[PDB]
From a paper:
Cytochromes P460 oxidise hydroxylamine within the nitrogen cycle and contain as their active site an unusual catalytic c-type haem where the porphyrin is crosslinked to the protein via a lysine residue in addition to the canonical cross links from cysteine residues. Cytochromes P460 consist of a homodimer with one haem P460 per monomer. The oxidation of hydroxylamine is a key part of the process of nitrification, whereby fixed nitrogen is converted to biologically available forms such as nitrate, in a range of bacteria. Here we describe the evidence for a novel double crosslink between lysine and haem in the cytochrome P460 from Methylococcus capsulatus (Bath).
To ascertain whether degradation of crystals over time was responsible for the variability in observed crosslinking, we collected diffraction data from crystals in situ 2 d after setting the crystallisation plate, and again 7 weeks later using other crystals from the same plate. Pleasingly, the fresh crystals yielded a structure with a clearly resolved conformation of Lys78. Since there are now four carbons bonded to C2A, they must all do so through single bonds to satisfy its valence. This means the C2A–C3A bond has been changed from double to single. The geometry around C3A remained clearly planar in the structure, so we assign it an exocyclic double bond, as evidenced by a shorter bond length to the terminal carbon on this tetrapyrrole ring D compared to all others (1.46 Å vs. 1.52 Å when using restraints without this double-bond; 1.33 Å when using double-bond restraints). We therefore tentatively built a double bond between the CD and CE carbons of Lys78 in the RT fresh and RT aged models. The RT fresh structure is very similar to the damage-free SFX structure (RMSD 0.14 Å across 286 residues).
Residue numbers in the entry:
A (entry chain B), B (entry chain A): 18 to 77, 78A, 79 to 161
Write the structure that this text describes.
């Protein structure tokens, strides 16, 4: 198993099998991202129960470097896998970080991010800008 | 329930719950895409059984117009849903179109695309360029 994050969160097993919530592309990072969630998160996302998200919801964002497809240069496609970011909802347990447990694992080798157990204050530094939306930027993508 | 495509392919039920294969962004369409697959496709993708893909594999590409996140302008995120494109592998049934059944549904209204039953020749026009990769451009995104 990969090492736990410095705040004690273990890597959610099976996240690559989870359902999609959305996708994104971060210009400044030259990354394509997929956002998945466990079934608690997906149910909440689809039913709009995101104020707050429920206890047990886990979101995962998977980031790859952007490359261009060798056969179709206008298609930006994933190259190198760069990291997996997680938010785990537990209003009581992570009340000090807004009710979410943050954790990041880097690369194929899955090195836990962060110098110490307060690393999540970095995450909060930006995610506080989405405080009105329970610290979550992502808007579930529309589907029929 | 949505009408079948002009070549007789019915919309696959439950595609929104399928596992992810990849993501992409098409620069000339200003979209973001998620590529999902049924469990045959996902197993094939993950094992590298793509030369050729096995019969029964279904790939779906979901497309949204790109929007910029209101709280974070360098984040391109899905706006309106534009289309669902499908490729259904059946080397015998779809031998005339490279072993793949193509189909597209447009919009939230899931209107079948295509003027007639030969609409898939359009798809083949470009997809023939990926013939070395069994007519599939997408490279499964690498995950640990
Ligand atoms: Fe973040
Ligand atoms: Fe295509």
């Amino acid at each position: 198993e990969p090492a736990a994050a410095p705040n004690g969160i273990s890597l959610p097993a099976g996240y690559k099998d989870w359902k999609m919530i959305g996708v994104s592309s971060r210009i400044e990072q030259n990354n394509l991202r997929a956002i998945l969630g466990n079934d608690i998160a997906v149910k909440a996302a689809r039913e709009g129960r995101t104020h707050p998200w429920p206890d047990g919801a886990i979101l995962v964002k998977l980031s790859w470097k952007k490359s261009t497809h060798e056969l179709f240069p206008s298609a930006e496609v994933p190259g190198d896998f760069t990291q997996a970011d997680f938010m785990v909802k537990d209003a009581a347990k992570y009340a000090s970080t807004g009710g979410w447990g943050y954790a990041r694992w880097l690369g194929m080798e899955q090195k836990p991010y962060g110098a110490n157990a307060d690393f999540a204050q970095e995450c909060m530094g930006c995610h506080s800008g989405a405080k009105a939306a329970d610290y979550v930027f992502t808007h579930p993508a529309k589907l029929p």
